[PDB]
Design a protein around this ligand. Structure first.
Ligand SMILES: Oc1ccc2cn[nH]c2c1
Ligand SMILES: Oc1ccc2cn[nH]c2c1
Ligand SMILES: Oc1ccc2cn[nH]c2c1
Ligand SMILES: Oc1ccc2cn[nH]c2c1
Lengths: 264, 263
């Protein structure tokens, strides 16, 4: 991978691996989300990082508040997918990281993603508005004029998500992360939550439809010793669902989301 | 990746990804096992295949009976690992696939693996002795003289593994595969079983030791709706005996042994 000519975005090519594909003979949404995370990590390393010096001094970290992914065409095993990523400050609310996925051979856009990140103290877990000092240190690596993967005036990436009411139409109970679901700092990887949300989609939908859109809100972390319940209700050719992840015991919410599926 | 000059083995380089590393900032054993599987798939595609023409129509498939992995040095995030793989027929018993892992920069051997594969009818699940017709269509892609990743006389890769007796010292119960744990044919990937075996190793061992050797025997496949119990007992470096069995009736799916070195 490499930073582009202006040094304001980062591009990388990936060849889809045999173990990365699902029952459709194409890359799963979890493989895509992992590649978005990988290109994001390489972009941060190429520019000196995704904590800055000031964040490390104040015990501050970036945490994902929302992830929105839209896939038009999933790459097959052996295909080359090219991913471009960039960041932008959104005032004092937080930062936004965007991605554009392309078929490396034809140059056609096959997917796009956008994520909202908030600043949090590592220890207290208290969210805070972005300070001007921290902002200045990020701005030199971001384009100054808006560059959005989802420009549209009424787009799906910014819609409010309601809380699923009991009883859920479908559910997958007792979901536990294993050690491979944890990252280098023993925290559950954000991609595992996508897998858990999709667990409550019935097999019939998986067999006859392809996941086209997923929007996921992150409210709370799931610990290594936590147990999760995944709940889904149909809200709708296309099928739409409302999703809720909550702790098995007391029902504390960890995530809420929406998915949109198109007939195969 | 590419077949070597003689076309009798296959080599491929992989750059370790950020999400592929664990708590010690190096590639997990599950990442390694996935790369061995990936280089094995690419070798089969490059020579005209993971099933022959005669095996197809006769509804025959290759299934893993044993996997033995030894890691001396795990690659870190950004490191380049070079993997060479080859196959050899072992008479009418089955086939063997071997791997050698190297640091691509220094050329030093950082790991090695060996796997035993048996022939099974995909429908009845009955194991079969390898027919001479199938043997012939495979021997043109394998070296004729023995080439072993584990040459040593009666080494760790060929030792018999006993059945763990109850009560187990440690256990992780109620383990279920999710859709990401299934492959392109909706079968649980062989790597998930490695993850499940290691789940019953206590966190204290994980924090103070590194996994150096794992030998795993496959007895029965776990279905998408099956629930598994992972059991471990210390037999000793630290050494453990492992058993994976169905939550309910206790039917055995796997047995194994691991060897860990102090960090
Ligand atoms: O559970 C699921 C269902 C659908 C998809 C698509 N990619 N990953 C999935 C997992
Ligand atoms: O057929 C293709 C080829 C490459 C890519 C990349 N994303 N989706 C694809 C589909
Ligand atoms: O549960 C475990 C424990 C140790 C390792 C090392 N790689 N992957 C593991 C999983
Ligand atoms: O430090 C290294 C560098 C590359 C490889 C490959 N396997 N292990 C390694 C360790």
């Amino acid at each position: 991978g490499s930073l582009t000519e202006d040094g304001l975005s980062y591009k990388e090519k990936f060849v889809v691996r045999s173990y990365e594909v699902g029952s459709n003979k194409t890359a799963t949404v979890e493989t895509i989300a992992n590649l978005l995370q990988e290109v994001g990590c390489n972009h941060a390393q190429s520019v000196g990082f995704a904590t800055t010096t000031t964040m490390r001094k104040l015990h501050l970290i970036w945490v994902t508040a929302r992830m929105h992914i839209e896939i038009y065409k999933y790459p097959a095993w052996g295909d080359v997918v090219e991913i471009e990523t960039w960041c932008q400050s959104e005032g004092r609310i937080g930062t936004r990281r965007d991605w554009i996925l392309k078929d490396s051979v034809t140059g056609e856009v096959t997917g796009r993603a956008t994520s909202k990140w908030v600043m949090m103290n590592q220890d207290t877990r208290r969210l805070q508005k972005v300070s001007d000092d921290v902002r200045d240190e990020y701005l030199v690596f971001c384009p100054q004029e808006p560059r959005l993967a989802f420009p549209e005036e009424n787009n799906r990436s910014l819609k409010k998500i309601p809380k699923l009411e009991d009883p859920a139409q479908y559910s997958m109970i007792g979901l536990k992360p294993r050690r491979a679901d944890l990252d280098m700092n023993q925290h559950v990887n954000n991609v595992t939550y996508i897998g858990w949300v999709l667990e409550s989609i019935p097999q019939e939908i998986v067999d006859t439809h392809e996941l086209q859109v997923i929007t996921l809100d992150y409210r709370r972390e799931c610990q290594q010793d936590d147990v999760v319940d995944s709940l889904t209700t149909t809200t709708s050719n296309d099928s739409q669902f409302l999703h809720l992840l909550r702790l098995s015991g007391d029902g504390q919410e960890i995530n809420r989301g929406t998915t949109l599926w198109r007939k195969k």
